[PDB]
Amino acid sequence: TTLAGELVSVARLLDREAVVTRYLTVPAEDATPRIRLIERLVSGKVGAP
Amino acid sequence: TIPADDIQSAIEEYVSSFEEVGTVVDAGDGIAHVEGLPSV
Structure with a gap:
């Protein structure tokens, strides 16, 4: 239920700021910069799963 | 929760971020589009 509470506002933010949505969407090969992007953004925001 | 608007950072x-083989996405009639290659 808190995975809901987490992920739903994750989606809220990702929707309202489409600019970085684009950058974490670019299908370049090595995700590592993008996983760093999203975790650097919201690691201290959420639970691990 | 919400970030402190530090998304620009x-x-x-x-x-x-700064091994670079872009992939062809479209092709036809002597014109291609290449994805990737951030430093061309």
Whole structure:
């Protein structure tokens, strides 16, 4: 239920700021910069799963 | 929860990212489009 509470506002933010949505969407090969992007953004925001 | 609007930082070091084989996405009649290749 808190995975809901987490992920739903994750989606809220990702929707309202489409600019970085684009950058974490670019299908370049090595995700590592993008996983760093999203975790650097919201690691201290959420639970691990 | 919500970030402190520091997304611009996240993106600017996402490109602080700074092995480069772009992939063809479209092709036809002597014109191609290539994805990737951030430093061309």
